[PDB]
Amino acid sequence: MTMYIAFILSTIFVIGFVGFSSKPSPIYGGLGLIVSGGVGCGIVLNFGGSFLGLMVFLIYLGGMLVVFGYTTAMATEMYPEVWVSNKTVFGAFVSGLMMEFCMVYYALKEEEVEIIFKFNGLGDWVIYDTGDSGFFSEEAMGIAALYSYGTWLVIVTGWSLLIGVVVIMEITRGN
Amino acid sequence: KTLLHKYSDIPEGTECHRKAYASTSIGGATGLIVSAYSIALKPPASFLEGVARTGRYTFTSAAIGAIFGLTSCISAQVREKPDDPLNYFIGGCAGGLTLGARTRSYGIGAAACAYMGLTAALVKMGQLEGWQVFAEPKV
Amino acid sequence: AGRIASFLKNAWAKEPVLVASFAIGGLAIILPSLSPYTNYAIRINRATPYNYPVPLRDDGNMPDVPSHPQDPQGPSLEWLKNL
Amino acid sequence: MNPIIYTTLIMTVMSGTMLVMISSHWLLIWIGFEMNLLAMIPVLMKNFNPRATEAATKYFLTQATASMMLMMAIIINLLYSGQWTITKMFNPVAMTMMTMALAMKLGLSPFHFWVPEVTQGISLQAGLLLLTWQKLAPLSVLCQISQSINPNLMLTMAMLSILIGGWGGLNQTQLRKIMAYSSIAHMGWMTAVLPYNTTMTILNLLIYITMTLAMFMLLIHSSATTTLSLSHTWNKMPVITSLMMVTLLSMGGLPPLSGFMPKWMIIQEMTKNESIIMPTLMAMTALLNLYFYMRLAYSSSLTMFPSTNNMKMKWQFEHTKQMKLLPTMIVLSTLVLPMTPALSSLN
Amino acid sequence: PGIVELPTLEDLKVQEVKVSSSVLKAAAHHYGAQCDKPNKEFMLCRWEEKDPRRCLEEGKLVNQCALDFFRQIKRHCAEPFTEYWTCIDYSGLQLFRHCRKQQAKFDECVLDKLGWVRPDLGELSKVTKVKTDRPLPENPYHSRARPEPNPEAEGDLKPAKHGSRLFFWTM
Amino acid sequence: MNIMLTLLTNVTLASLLVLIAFWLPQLNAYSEKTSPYECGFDPMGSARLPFSMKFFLVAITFLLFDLEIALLLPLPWASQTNNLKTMLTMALFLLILLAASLAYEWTQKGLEWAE
Amino acid sequence: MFMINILSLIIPILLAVAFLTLVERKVLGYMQLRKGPNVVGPYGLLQPIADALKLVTKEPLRPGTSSISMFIIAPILGLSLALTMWVPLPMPYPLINMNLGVLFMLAMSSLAVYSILWSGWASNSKYALIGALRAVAQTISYEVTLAIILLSVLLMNGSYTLSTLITTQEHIWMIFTSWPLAMMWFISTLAETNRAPFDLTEGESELVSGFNVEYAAGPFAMFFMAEYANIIMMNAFTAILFLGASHDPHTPELYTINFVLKTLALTITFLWIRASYPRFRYDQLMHLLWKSFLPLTLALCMWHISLPIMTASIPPQS
Amino acid sequence: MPLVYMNIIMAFAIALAGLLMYRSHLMSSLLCLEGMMLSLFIMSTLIILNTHFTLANMMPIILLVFAACEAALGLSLLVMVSNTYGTDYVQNLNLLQC
Amino acid sequence: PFFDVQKRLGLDLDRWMTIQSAEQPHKIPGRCHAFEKEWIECAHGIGGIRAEKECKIEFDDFVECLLRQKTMKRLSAIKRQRDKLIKEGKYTPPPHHLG
Amino acid sequence: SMMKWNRERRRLQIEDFEARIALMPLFQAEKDRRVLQMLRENLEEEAI
C-alpha cells in the first residue's frame, strides 16, 4: 500500500546500495548505485526536500557518468564480472539481501528494537509536523541563504574547488 | 563486557562449575579475536585450513581459559585462601605449560610459568586493593 | 599605448570570443556599483512582505507606528508604485 | 609540482589544517580535513615515482574512509542533539564513532598500519610534512572533545600504539620506516594523557614536533634513507652524525635531554589521577623505542663504518642547500629540560 | 509530568465564515481595512501569550467581525461581489490581474453604498499598534528558575607563592 | 499519486513495446547471425580490453564543474534576498573562480587532447 | 480521468514522433532536388506505418556476446525517459505542474545518456565501445553549459517553474533579451539530441551506425523514438524558453496553436541544419564548447545576474 | 527513532562493509566511497527538513560538493595506477611492502 | 574553537548556523526554537560540567522535541491497544474518526 | 521591456501578499480551533 511508501522507497535504496557494495563489475556497480541514487531522491523528495532531491539526482548522474567512462577506459577486464558469475560477489550479493530481510522483519514485527539505537517502527508519516510554509519553500529558501549568510562557506568551498582543479592537474601531470 | 563481569561475581574456587564455565568463555572468546586478525593480516589459503588457524587458536585460548579456572579452583577450596595470589600463580601458569603443550613446545612452556604465573598473580591484589588499569580522570 | 592597442587588435582578430566574454564579463562586475537603482533593488526586496507584520502593544509615546493599516503615519512606498 | 603552485599546494594544507583549530562548527571542522587531505596527495607524489603513487593511494583510502566515518559521528550527534558546536557528544556511540575515525586520521590503533607504509614511498621532505603537520589537525579536535571521550577507549588505543609502535621498530633497516614507528609510538604517548589533562598532550606534541623537525633536517642533510647509506655519513660530515646521536638520545627520552620531559610530565599527571600501572607499562615499553634508537646510533657515530674512495670527491664540495632552522631545533629539542615550568604557558 | 489543559467542546463552538477561497481573496483588501481591530488584537495575543488555548475568545471575536463584514457585503453590494469572486475563481492562481474590470465595479460599489476605501498598495502591510488591555504574559515560555552563575572572579593578582612550585624549581 | 502513476505508465508501455518486438517476429538464430559485427570481416577479438581514451583530464574536471553548477543554481531564489550587495559579490566570486579554474585548466595545456 | 490524460499526452506524441520521420525524409529530400517518400499511400503519408510494422515484425537480433539483461534495459530506459520528460511541459496548462520543472528537465535529460551508454557497452563490439565513449565525450562537455544557460535565462524569469515562463514572456519574447544565449542554447539543444553537425555517436560514414550497430527490429525501433521524441520535446522546451506565446486565460486554444507552430518551425530548422552543414569531429566539438562556448557562458551568466540587481528589475519569486 | 532514519543508518553500515572489506578492483572500492556519501547526504537532509533547520539546509550540498572531490582525486589515482601498471586490480601495487 | 579567532577579530564565520534558534532567513522558526531558546540561556556561562545536571529536565524536553522518542512510544502503545480489542471487537471508533 | 514588466509583476506580488496577510488572522483563527478540536477528540476517546 502507499501508506508505507517511504518504507518501501527506503528499502530499494539499500538493495541497490547492497548490490553495488558487493563489488560487481565497476559499471554494474554504477547501475547499482544509480538505482539507489534515483530512489534515494524519492525519499528526500517525499519529505519535502525537492531541491535537495533534484541536485543529488542531477550531479550524481553526472558523477556516475564520468565514472563509467573511466571504468571502460582503464578499469575493465576482458572477462567482465557479473553479480552471478563470480561466487565471491554472489556470496556478497546473497548476504546483503537477507541482512535487510531479517532485520526489517524484526523492526516491523516488534516495532521497539534495540540494535545500536532504539527505533519505533510505527510510521515515518508520524513525525511530519503541523506547519505552514507561507509563500516560500523552506527547503529552497534556506539554500538561497548560502549567498547572503554563508559567505565563509562560499569562500572555503569555492577556494577548495580551485585547488580541486589544481590537484586534478598536479597529480596527472605525468612528469 | 558482561562475560568477564559474570566471572567476577562468581567467587574463586567455590561454584567452580560456574566459575570454570566463565573462565572457559573469556579464554576461548579471545581466541576468535586473535585468530580474526591472524586470518586478517596473515593471509590463509583455504576455508578448511582457515578455520584450522582459528582451530588451534580457539583450542588454546579455550584450554588456558579452562585450566586457569579449574587449577585456580582447586587451590581456592583445598587451601581455603582464595584471596591469595598463589591460587592464580599455579592456577594461571599451569595453562601456560599446557599452552606450551598445545604448541607442543615445553620449552616456551617452560618460560610460560615465569610470565603467566606472574601476571595471573598481579590481578589478585588488583581485586583486593583499589588498583585500576583504566583510571577515570579524577583530577 | 601602441602595444596595448595592437594587442587588443591582434586579439580581436585572432579570437573574437574570449575578448567578447572578457569585455561583457568585465562590465558585469563594475556597473552594479555605479548603477543608481541598486539601492532601489534592495528596497523592492525589503518591501515585499512574506511574513506577517506582527502588531505590537501600545504603551503611549509611539507616534511613528500607526494604530490602523490606513493611518497616514508609518512606512509608505509610493516611490515603488511609480517605479 | 611547479614552484609557484607548489607553494599554494602547501598553503591550502596549512590553511585547511588551520580551519580545524579556528572553527567552531562541526561541518567546518569536517571541511578542514579534506582540504588538508585533497592537497596533501599531490606533494606526496611530487617526485612521482611508482612508489610515490603507491604511497599516496594507501593514504587516500585510509584518510578518505576516516573522514567518511568522521561525517556520521557529526550527523548522529546532530540527529541526537541538534547542535554543530564543538562540544561533548550527546550520544555515546557517536563519541566512540568519532574516536574510531580520528584514530585512523592519526594512526593510533591497528590503523597505525598505514603510517609506516606511506612513509617509505613519499620522499623525506614529504615525510617531514606528514608525521609532523598532518597530526596537528586530529589532535586539536581530540583536545576540544576531551570532555566526553571514553577513558578506557582512549587509553586502550594509546597503549597499543606505544606497544606495536615500539615493537614494530625492532625490525626495520630503512630510516623512514624506523622513523614512522617512532612517530607511531609517540602518537600513543600524547594520546594516553588526553583525557586527564590536555595541556600535556600539547607539550608532548610540541617536543615531538621540534624533535621530528630536527630529525628530518639531519636526514635530508645526510641525504640517506638506509642505515648503510647513513653509516657512510660519518666520513663526509661527522658533525651531522654526531648530532644525529644526541637527538637519537632524546628519542629514547633519556634525561637530562628534552625527550624526557614529555614522558616525565605525562607520568606525573597520570599518577595524580591514580593510574600507576598504565604509566609504568608504557615506561617499560618505551625501552623498545630506545633500543632501535641505540642501534641506529651505533651504525651512525659510535662505530666507524666502511666508506668509499669516490666519496673523497665530495670533500671538495659542500651543501649548497641550507634550509634555515636546523641549528635552532637541535638546541630546542636537546637542552630544554631546565625550562619545564614554561609548560604552564600552554595552559 | 503534568496535565494537558484544553477548553471543552462548548468553548470552541462558533459559526465559521463558510465562503470559499476566491470570495475571501476578492474581499481580502476591504476585509483587512475594515476588520483589522479584531485581527490585530487576536494575532497580537497569539504572539504574546504563545498559546491558542489562552486566546480562543479572541478567535471568537474575529469570526464575528468577519461575519458582520461579510453580512453587510451581501446586504448592499451583493451582485458586484458575485461577479468579482467568480471571475477570480476561474483563474488557477486567483490572480488579481485578470479581474481589474470587475474589481472597479466592486470598488465603487462599496465606496458609495458601504462607504469603504480600497487600501493602497503597501498601506495594508504596514505594521500597526494595538491598544489591547490584556495583561502581559510574565512567563510566556513557562521557564523555570535558572542556574545561578559560577562564583565570580575578584581580588588582585599577587606573585605565585614560591614561584612555579613544580618539582625542584625554586623559582 | 500522479507522478509515479505517470512514471509507472511509461515503463509499462515501453515494456510491452520491447515485449512484442522481441517475441512476435518468428525468430531464427544460427550462431553466425548472432556473431559480432566487424564491418564485414571477423572481429580481432576483444571489445572489453581497456579502451584508453585521451580526454581523461577533461573528464574529471567536468565532475568538478558540475559540483559548482549545483552551487550556483539557487541564484533565482538568492536574488530575492535583502542583502544583494553581499549576494552579488559572492555570486560573482563563483563565476570568477570557475573561469579562473578553467583558465589554469586551459593555459597549462589541460583542455588539449592527449596524443 | 487522470489516466486518460496520461494516454492523451503519450499517444498523440507518439504519432507526432512517427510523422517526424516522414517529414524529415520529405524535408531532406526536397532540400536535395529529390521528392521524398510519396508512394506509400498518398504523398507518402503511410510511410511511417509501413516502417512501423516492418520493424516490430523484423527479426530482433540477439548477439551472443551481448549481456542480455543490460541489452534490454537500454531501449526501455531510452523510451521511458523520452515520454516522462514531456509531462512537465506547460502546454497551455502543464500536465505535471512542479515548482522545479527545469531541474526535472535536466535530471532525465542527464539520465538519457545511460541508454546509449549501457547499450554501447552491452553490444560488446569495437564500434559499440567507440560510439558509447564518444557519446560520453559528446555529452560530457554538454551538461556544464546546459545548466548555465538554463540558469542565466531563467534568473530573470523568477523561479524554476515552467508555468510562470509564460507570465514572464507575456510582453516580449525571451529571445529579444537573451539572443546571445538563445543561439548558444539552440546549438546545445541541437547537440544534446545528437543531431546535425554533432552526430558523432551515430556517425554513419565513420562508425557505420555507432551504438545502434547491433540493434535491430523493435529494440532499434525503440531507439528511434527516444532520439526523435527528444527532438520534438527539446524544441518545445526552446519554444517556451525563448518564444513564449500569448496565453488567453479563457481559451487555451490560442496558446496551443501558437506553441505547436513554434515547435514545428524549430523542428524543421533541426532538419534544415541537418541537411546543410557537414559533421564535426568529437575533439573539435569538445574544443568548440569548452574553449569557446563555456567562456562565453560564464560572462553571459555574469551579465545576467548583475543585470536584474543593477536595473532594480529582479523578478517575483512566488 | 523512525524506520526512515533506521534504514538509512543501516545503509551506511554495509557501505562501510563494502568499503574496507576489499576486492580485486580499486574502482569498485571507490565506487563504494562515493556511495556512502548517499547515505550521509540523505540522512542529513532528513533531519534538517524534519527540524525546520533553514540555515543547515545548505550543509547537504556543501557536504555533497566536497563529496565528489574525493572521487575526483580518487579517479586520478586510478589512471596512473593504470598508466604505470596497465591494470587496476589491487595486488600489483606492493613494491612499497619493503 | 581551539584557537578562537572568531571572537578575537570580531567576525562571524560559522556561529550563525551552529544552532537552530539563531536568526533564520525571513524569520522562519525552527521546530524546537522554544526549547533551544530555553536550553541555551539555561546553561550559558555557567559551565559545561555544571550543565548536565541542572539544565537537564529542560534539555530532554528539547531532545524529545527533535525526536519525539517517548511521544512516538505513546502512539505505538495506543495503536497497539487498538489492534488488541478491534480484533476482539469490544469498541468501535466514533463517526468523528470515519467521517 | 523586461525591466518594466518585471517591476509590474513585483507590484502584483505585494498586492497578492497584502491580500494574503490581511486574510491571515482568520486562517490562524480557524487553525487553532481545529487542532484543539482534533486534540480533544483523541483525548476524549483516549479515556475509553
Side-chain angles (χ1 to χ4, degrees), chain B residues 36-46 49-50 53, chain H residues 97:
Chain B
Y37 310 97
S38 87
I39 272 70
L41 302 317
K42 261 184 246 154
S46 94
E49 63 73 32
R53 209 105 66 79
Chain H
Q97 198 210 355

Side-chain angles (χ1 to χ4, degrees), chain E residues 7-17 31 38-39 41-42 45 52-53 55-68, chain J residues 25-26 28-30 32-34 36-37:
Chain E
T8 187
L9 255 299
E10 310 85 283
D11 317 337
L12 66 171
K13 313 223 161 315
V14 58
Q15 166 279 17
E16 310 96 329
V17 279
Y31 167 65
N39 294 357
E41 70 91 20
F42 173 60
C45 100
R53 80 183 32 122
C55 268
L56 276 204
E57 207 293 316
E58 308 85 301
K60 306 317 180 134
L61 202 295
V62 65
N63 283 107
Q64 192 279 342
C65 302
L67 266 172
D68 215 296
Chain J
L26 186 269
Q28 198 89 67
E30 300 189 348
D32 40 341
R33 301 203 296 277
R34 313 312 284 161
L36 284 192
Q37 202 285 295

Side-chain angles (χ1 to χ4, degrees), chain C:
Chain C
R3 149 140 58 80
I4 302 309
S6 95
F7 146 75
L8 294 211
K9 220 211 207 198
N10 174 262
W12 211 306
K14 176 182 162 103
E15 82 76 3
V17 39
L18 319 91
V19 45
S21 74
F22 264 113
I24 75 89
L27 312 145
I29 326 189
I30 81 163
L31 318 86
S33 55
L34 304 308
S35 153
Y37 307 97
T38 181
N39 37 6
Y40 256 36
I42 45 185
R43 287 229 270 144
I44 288 156
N45 284 48
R46 184 188 321 286
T48 297
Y50 300 82
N51 42 15
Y52 196 89
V54 158
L56 52 55
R57 179 167 296 218
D58 278 304
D59 63 345
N61 202 92
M62 297 165 81
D64 326 303
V65 317
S67 211
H68 186 292
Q70 292 255 354
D71 293 353
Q73 70 272 26
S76 99
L77 43 76
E78 304 47 26
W79 63 271
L80 174 275
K81 182 208 65 35
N82 329 290
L83 189 269

